[PDB]
Design a protein around this ligand. Structure first.
Ligand SMILES: O=C(O)c1cc(=O)[nH]c(=O)n1[C@@H]1O[C@H](COP(=O)(O)O)[C@@H](O)[C@H]1O
Ligand SMILES: O=C(O)c1cc(=O)[nH]c(=O)n1[C@@H]1O[C@H](COP(=O)(O)O)[C@@H](O)[C@H]1O
Lengths: 256, 256
């Protein structure tokens, strides 16, 4: 098993994965903030204050009541200043011809500002081929959704294996997974795990939580994605630091 | 087998399904236009000219370069005038807590103008529960994606059966399917089938085509969804009429 810093140098590493792994090692963070807010001002204030604590800020641009491309410009300024990637959690899941347009165009122009996006594998590999036609020229990366945190998820068994094959066959663009665990044995791929809180529980709409120690330490994932565990806390900076320290020590203890 | 007009009166019919089935029978159309354009002016000119020929206009609001809520007000005026449903093909596919916000809020406010949306079933039934908490109060309907037209689709076998169960267990909100065929034996549910052209072929990104006669007549679906077969034609009105007559006759001939 290699450190994040050594994985950043692997022969087959994608440039976006390398950039991420280098700043994870530099900053001692494997925390992705899920910035699940409706106000641009709150998004930017969280990005600025928590930027030093995170390797990545995950957006849902389509829930931002006051989205503009200028808001995204300000988010990029903060991402460059504090050194984190921007991940738009759009979950592309249509035919290749459609997702190419959804990624490049419309009002969001996601590819213009998102380092990373993700896709469901259920439509077959055309979803990746469509995205990669926009994303490769724009030097972007993609994550494939191999496992899901929600109750009744059908992303199990052969489905998860199909996601890993699709990633490993599109390594020029696919840099890793949304998963609950290590699903690829190839260290070039990132594993990002949502459904994370320090305490046991869930929500009223099928979300299930596991701890940073469980998903990084026992299940072998790389990065925790945390929304409400941070966003609903009074002091979001201290909450981010709690999650960062938990995920980082779980990673170190797996390394030995 | 019942006519569209008789299905509109079934005891367990959803009001949105009933409205659709009545206008299908009245207008002799089971064609859904896939309005896959980037200009509001082209969207509205297609909606006005093709409105009489269609039961439904399917949008991808996120590929419109000049989206505003006032464009959607103008589309509703045309939908009311010509009598067709608006279906936003958003393919919700996240945890319930997230999709509720993606459906109601952000820039698009999809639930405010879309009669129908659709969802992938891969996250489990929380995706439907989250949507239905916005959609039920707003008297909307939802389609579940049981089968997909694209090469390598994983929406087969047990996955398709899971989509049908999830629909039949959420009948207060789910009114049917995106599918390639009849997948439910319950006549209250609508089957809408994309991947339709008169000629054999596909696209360069995994789209596969079947004819209206195949999907309505042999495979037992209700509605054809047609994009490029109409949109790329010179005379989009005549193309819509050719698809409408094909789908309608295939429906009549299965009815006997
Ligand atoms: O792609 C994701 O990040 C995602 C996948 C998944 O399996 N589960 C999951 O919860 N998510 C997202 O991660 C975040 C979870 O947030 P919290 O439950 O508030 O921590 C939400 O924004 C979800 O949309
Ligand atoms: O949900 C859909 O309508 C959809 C599902 C599917 O399995 N296949 C599919 O092609 N679609 C959509 O239907 C349209 C097909 O357009 P054409 O290939 O141009 O006729 C596109 O807008 C797709 O996003």
């Amino acid at each position: 098993e290699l450190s994040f810093g050594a994985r950043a140098e692997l022969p087959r590493i994608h440039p976006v994965a390398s950039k991420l792994l280098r700043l994870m090692q530099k900053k001692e963070t494997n925390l992705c903030l899920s910035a699940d807010v409706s106000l641009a001002r709150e998004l930017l204030q969280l990005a600025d204050a928590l930027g030093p604590s995170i390797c990545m800020l995950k957006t849902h641009v389509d829930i931002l009541n006051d989205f503009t491309l200028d808001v995204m410009k300000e988010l990029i300024t903060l991402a460059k200043c504090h050194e984190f990637l921007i991940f738009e959690d759009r979950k592309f899941a249509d035919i290749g011809n459609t997702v190419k347009k959804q990624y490049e165009g419309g009002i969001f122009k996601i590819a213009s500002w998102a380092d990373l996006v993700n896709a469901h594998v259920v439509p077959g590999s055309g979803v990746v081929k469509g995205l990669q036609e926009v994303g490769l020229p724009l030097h972007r990366g993609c994550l494939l959704i191999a496992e899901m945190s929600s109750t009744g998820s059908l992303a199990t068994g052969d489905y998860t294996r199909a996601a890993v094959r699709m990633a490993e066959e599109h390594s020029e663009f696919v840099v890793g997974f949304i998963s609950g665990s290590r699903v690829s044995m190839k260290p070039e791929f990132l594993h990002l795990t949502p459904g994370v809180q320090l305490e046991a529980g869930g929500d009223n709409l099928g979300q299930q939580y596991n701890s940073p120690q469980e998903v990084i330490g026992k299940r072998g994932s790389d990065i925790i994605i945390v929304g409400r565990g941070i966003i609903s806390a009074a002091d979001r900076l201290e909450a981010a630091e709690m999650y960062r320290k938990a995920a980082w020590e779980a990673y170190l203890s797996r390394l030995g």
